[PDB]
């Protein structure tokens, strides 16, 4: 039916040191707060970083999110991809104080140098 | 905890014998819980319409009570108000000159 | 802290299953979420105060219950095969945009019959003597294998307690056949030459309870151990 | 010189009942929406006729917003009991005023977000929309909690953005209705009051909006320190009423002139006593 | 539209 948050790809494997780019599209143009949740294997999801409509980028160190109201799409960029970063990354959106709506989540494996 | 201000007045200019509306206007009070009675000759007037609760920029609440009334050459009307801020109920009689 | 129980559960189609959650955040909002094979976080039921609960996006076949403010429970009256998934509890303060704090997870397998259920065969491999001389470190490998389904908790143990530092225990089980799973695990240490040190690979199989209807494989701890070879 | 304001109240009640939550929205000080938890079927409801424009989704989602606010105040009330170490079985009030002022250039003038507990100021967002003012020690707990969660960033985003975006929309939708004014009809009354003196009283009736000025003057000068003035009061039909009054000597009533200033008046009325 | 609060008091 209504894919309110569409996440791509589903699994993403990258060589340690690269930059990862996760992408996300939402349908409801009114959504104005987008948290990302990060899920290590066996652990529960935990809040990674978030951005409001009013901004274009938020960045905590290595992780950095890109909102774009017009094309109605959102994205996460991790810059020094270590294997610590291997987890399922969940894109979320909501309006106001409505309840959070998660994506299907992108599974990121950062393969280690050797 | 603010002590209510009361005004008792009619909607239309008062012509005894002719239908009208009597108003009790209670403002500058806090907390919101208040008891308002409209009296006809000392006696509680049965059906009294009330406005919805509202407050002012200073945080205090106000409210309009009213009922249909036909003034006469002698009947007294009044508004009686009970509220936490007053140790006893204040009563205010209608006065066509005000 | 958000803490669920049980951490794993096997059930027969038509059984009653009951997932529980506790939290000590003094939060009013609590949630039960469903994940399916690592993807998705679909809301089943939530609650913003006891003793009420509200419908989520996927309530069909599920019922919630909020006795305390601290506790929240999801209940399956007749478990179907389609309710095989992982479940997450969460909590959050009331108001908007407050962060969901999620529990660590509860795995649920629902099965036609309990025939293919099999506990693991636990192997302990002693560290390669090429590595002992070469880098001066001993990787004690442990392997759990031939179990079904993947509901196995593998801890290392030593002289009694466990360190948690040195363990490269696999994330995912491996599907070595259709009704057969497997799970590798490593331990990195030096200490090993000495034969006074005890070493143990314990694996806990989250199988059937005693309630549930041949070696009937219940919830069980099957381990394997070795002493120091100098 | 425009504005939006949403006024919100929660009242604790001892006994079985949860707190009552009422939210009233104002545009240019004119009530346009209301929500009340005690209503039979609680939802936001239009108040002016110009809001019937908005479609089901507007009401449905604003209604969902209210229900979240309701719980917010329920939890905030409880926490406040704890802070002031208050006993159970009390009735306590929590209040929020919130909104944006606007220039004729459609630009944010001032943002407002403030609270009161038991009719005393509790916490308010400062004019900068970044920092807080805490009235007492209990409020200082809240302030810290809100600094750690980064609340002000989010209120700011609503105020500068959504408040302003939406105030625009509403003024375009109800242009004909906020334009309305009603002229005061005024007259003077004569009340032989004491021995020697009388009371002259200048009424003004049938007028809207509420703002108005009445002045008595004796031969050029203004009589503010000897005048009685009553707070402006609603008739109940939509209009308003006010009167001002003076204590003069009998015979000399023609000396005194009342004056009435109002927006909808094309020129201020001047008035004198007639027999 | 109406404001919406975040953390409780």
A85: CB partners within 8 A, 6+ apart: A20, A78, A108, A110
Resolution in Å, one decimal, please: 2.8
Same structural domain for residues C117 and C164?
yes
- The answer to whether the CB of B60 falls within 8 A of the CB of D119 is yes
Longest dimension (CA), chain D: 73
Give the nearest partner residue to D68 out of A52, A53, A97, using CB atoms: A97
Point out residues after which chain C has a gap (C–N over 2.5 Å): 190, 213
Boundary-marking domain end, from C84, C112, C140: C112
Of C112, C137, C153, the residue that ends a domain is C112
Q: Are B69 and D161 in contact (CB under 8 A)?
A: no
Neighbours of chain B (3+ CB pairs under 8 A): D
A95 → chain E, closest CA residue: E4
A44 neighbourhood in chain C, CB within 8 Å: 2, 88, 90, 102-105
Spatial separation of the C-alpha atoms in residues C206 and C10, rounded to whole Å: 8
Q: Name the one residue in this structure whose structure tokens are 């009530």.
A: D31
C206: left (phi over 0), alpha (psi -120 to 50) or beta: beta
Alpha-carbon gap: B42 to the closest alpha carbon of chain D (Å): 24
Q: What is the Cα–Cα distance from B73 to D220, expressed in whole angstroms?
A: 40
Question: What range does the domain containing B82 cover?
Answer: 1-98
Q: Of A10, A12, A45, A89, which to mutate for an interface test with C (greatest number of C Cβ within 10 Å)?
A: A45
Range of the domain at C44: 1-112
How far apart, in whole angstroms, are the C-alpha atoms of residue D68 and residue E4?
8
The chain C residues in contact with chain E (CB within 8 A) are: 93-98
- Going along chain D from its start, the domains and CATH numbers come out as 1-180 (3.30.500.10), 181-271 (2.60.40.10)
Query: Alpha helices of C30-120 — where are they, by DSSP H?
Result: none
- Following DSSP, what letter does each residue of B43-92 receive, concatenated? EE-S--EEPPPEE-TTS-EEEEEEEEE---SS--EEEEEEETTSSS-EEE
D-chain residue closest to A53, CA distance: D157
Sign of CA dihedral A52, A53, A54, A58: positive
- For D79, the closest chain C residue by CA position comes to C26
The three state secondary structure string of E1-9 is CCCCCCCCC
On whether both C52 and C78 belong to a single domain, the answer is yes
Cross-strand partners of B91: B80
Q: Are 3 or more Cβ–Cβ pairs between D and C shorter than 8 Å?
A: yes
Domain count, chain B: 1
Q: Which residues of C50-75 are buried (b: 16+ CB within 10 A; e: fewer)?
A: beebeebeeeeebebbbeebbebbbe
Q: Do C38 and A102 touch (CB under 8 A)?
A: no
Method: X-ray
Instruction: Using CB atoms within 10 Å of the CB of residue D71, give its burial: 0 to 12 exposed, 13 to 18 middle, 19+ buried.
Output: buried
With contacts defined as CB-CB under 8 Å, which chain A residues touch E8?
A: none
Boundary (domain end) residue, out of C75, C90, C112: C112
Chain C environment of A37 (Cβ under 8 Å): 41, 100
Rounded CA-CA distance D128/D110 in Å is 9
CB D178 within 8 A of CB A77: no
- Clarify whether residues C101 and C206 are in a common domain: no
Q: Which residues of C touch D (CB under 8 A)?
A: 28-29, 48-49, 93-98
Interchain contact, A52 vs D154, CB within 8 Å: yes
Q: C142 and C108: one domain?
A: no
User: Which residues in chain B have Cβ-Cβ distances shorter than 8 Å to D201?
Assistant: 97
In the three-class reduction of DSSP (H, G, I as helix; E, B as strand; rest coil), residue D29 is classed as coil
Smallest CA–CA distance, residue D155 to chain C, in Å, is 11
Q: E4–D69: do the CB atoms touch at under 8 Å?
A: yes
Q: Tell me the backbone φ, ψ of residue C82, rounded to 5 degrees.
A: -65, -10
Residue E4 with chain D: CB contacts under 8 Å: 65, 68-69, 158
Burial class (CB in 10 A: 0-12, 13-18, 19+), C148: buried
Q: Do A32 and D157 touch (CB under 8 A)?
A: yes
CB-count burial class (<10 Å; 0-12, 13-18, 19+) for D248: buried
β-bridge pairing C8-12 and C106-111: parallel
Considering the domain architecture, whether residues C166 and C67 belong to the same structural domain is answered as no
Closest CA to D1 of D74, D101, D129, D140: D101
Query: Chains that contact E by 3+ CB pairs under 8 Å?
Result: A, C, D
Query: Domains of chain A: which residue ranges?
Result: 1-114
Å between D203 CA and nearest CA of chain B: 9
Chain C residues close to E1, C-beta within 8 Å: none
The rounded distance, in Å, linking the Cα atoms of C133 and B97 is 112
Q: What is the CATH classification number for the domain harbouring B64?
A: 2.60.40.10
CATH code, A1-114:
2.60.40.10
Pairing label, strands D30-36, D45-46? antiparallel
Q: Is A41 on the interface with C (CB under 8 A)?
A: yes
CA of D205, closest CA in chain C: separation in Å?
45
C61: domain CATH number is: 2.60.40.10
Structural domains in chain C (count): 2
Alpha-carbon Rg of chain B, whole angstroms? Answer: 14
Is C83 found in the same domain as C139? no
Query: Cβ of C94 and D154 within 8 Å?
Result: no
- Same structural domain for residues C118 and C224? yes
Tell me the longest C-alpha to C-alpha distance in chain A: 46
Query: Taking CA atoms, what residue in A is nearest to C31?
Result: A99
Show Cβ contacts of residue C22 under 8 Å, excluding neighbours closer than 6 positions: C2, C3, C4, C5, C70, C71
Give the nearest partner residue to C104 out of A43, A99, A102, using CB atoms: A43
């Amino acid at each position: 039916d209504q894919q309110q948050v569409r996440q791509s790809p589903q699994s993403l494997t990258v060589w340690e040191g690269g930059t990862t780019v996760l992408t996300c599209s939402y349908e409801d143009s009114t959504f104005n707060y987008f948290p990302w949740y990060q899920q290590f294997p066996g652990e529960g999801p935990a809040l990674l970083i978030s951005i409001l409509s009013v901004s274009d980028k938020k960045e905590d160190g290595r992780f950095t999110t890109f909102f774009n109201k017009r094309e109605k799409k959102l994205s996460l960029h991790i810059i020094d991809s270590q294997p610590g970063d291997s987890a399922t990354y969940f894109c979320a959106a909501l309006y106001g104080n409505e309840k959070i709506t998660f994506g299907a989540g992108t599974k990121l494996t950062i393969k280690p140098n050797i | 905890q603010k002590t209510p201000q009361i005004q008792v007045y009619s909607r239309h200019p008062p012509e005894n014998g002719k239908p009208n509306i009597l108003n009790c206007y209670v403002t500058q009070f806090h907390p919101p819980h208040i008891e308002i009675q409209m009296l006809k000759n000392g006696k509680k007037i049965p059906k009294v319409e009330m406005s919805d609760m509202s407050f002012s920029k200073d945080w205090s609440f106000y409210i309009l009570a009213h009922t249909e009334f036909t003034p006469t050459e002698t009947d007294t009307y009044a508004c009686r108000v009970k509220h936490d801020s007053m140790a006893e109920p204040k009563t205010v009689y209608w006065d066509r000159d005000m | 802290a958000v803490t669920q129980s049980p951490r794993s559960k096997v059930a027969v189609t038509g059984g009653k299953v009951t997932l529980s959650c506790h939290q000590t955040n003094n939060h009013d909002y609590m949630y039960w979420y469903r994940q399916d094979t690592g993807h998705g976080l679909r809301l089943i039921h939530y609650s913003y105060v006891a003793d009420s609960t509200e419908k989520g996006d996927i309530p069909d076949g599920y019922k919630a219950s909020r006795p305390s403010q601290e506790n929240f429970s999801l209940i399956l009256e007749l478990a179907s095969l389609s309710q095989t998934a992982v479940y997450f509890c969460a909590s959050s303060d009331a108001g908007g945009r407050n962060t969901l704090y999620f529990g660590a997870g509860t795995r649920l397998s629902v099965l036609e019959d309990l025939r293919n259920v099999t506990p693991p065969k636990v192997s302990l491999f002693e560290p390669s003597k090429a590595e002992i001389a070469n880098k001066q470190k001993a990787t004690l490998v442990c392997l759990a294998r031939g179990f079904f389904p993947d509901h196995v908790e593998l801890s290392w143990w030593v002289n009694g307690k466990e360190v948690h530092s040195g363990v490269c225990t696999d994330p995912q089980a491996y599907k070595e056949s259709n009704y057969s799973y497997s799970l590798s695990s490593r331990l990195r240490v030096s200490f090993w030459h000495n034969p006074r040190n005890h070493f143990r690979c314990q694996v806990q199989f989250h199988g059937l309870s005693e309630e549930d209807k041949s070696p009937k494989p219940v919830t069980q701890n099957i381990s394997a151990e070795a002493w120091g070879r100098a | 010189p425009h504005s939006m304001r949403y006024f919100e109240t929660a009242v604790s009640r001892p006994g079985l009942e949860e707190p009552r939550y009422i939210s009233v929205g104002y545009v240019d000080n004119k009530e346009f929406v209301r929500f009340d938890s005690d209503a039979e079927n609680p939802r936001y409801e239009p108040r002016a006729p110009w809001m019937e424009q908005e479609g089901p989704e507007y009401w449905e989602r604003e209604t969902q917003k209210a229900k979240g606010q309701e719980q917010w105040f329920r939890v905030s009330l409880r926490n406040l009991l704890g802070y002031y170490n208050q006993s159970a079985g009390g009735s306590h009030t929590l209040q929020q005023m919130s909104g944006c002022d606007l220039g004729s250039d459609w630009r944010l003038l001032r943002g407002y977000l403030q609270f009161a507990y038991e009719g005393r100021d509790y916490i308010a967002l400062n004019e900068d929309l970044k920092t807080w003012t805490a009235a007492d020690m209990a409020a200082q707990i809240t302030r810290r909690k809100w600094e750690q969660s980064g609340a002000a960033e989010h209120y700011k985003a609503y105020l500068e953005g959504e408040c302003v975006e939406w105030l625009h929309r509403y003024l375009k939708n109800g242009n004909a209705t906020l334009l309305r004014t009603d002229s005061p009809k005024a007259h003077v009354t004569h009340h032989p009051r004491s021995k020697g003196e009388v009371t002259l009283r200048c009424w003004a009736l049938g007028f809207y909006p509420a703002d108005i000025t009445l002045t008595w003057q004796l031969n050029g000068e203004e009589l503010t320190q000897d005048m009685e003035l009553v707070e402006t009061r609603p008739a109940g039909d939509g209009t308003f009423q006010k009167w001002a009054s003076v204590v003069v000597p009998l015979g000399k009533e023609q000396n005194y002139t009342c004056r009435v200033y109002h927006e909808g008046l094309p020129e201020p009325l001047t008035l004198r006593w007639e027999p | 539209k109406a404001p919406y609060n975040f953390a409780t008091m």
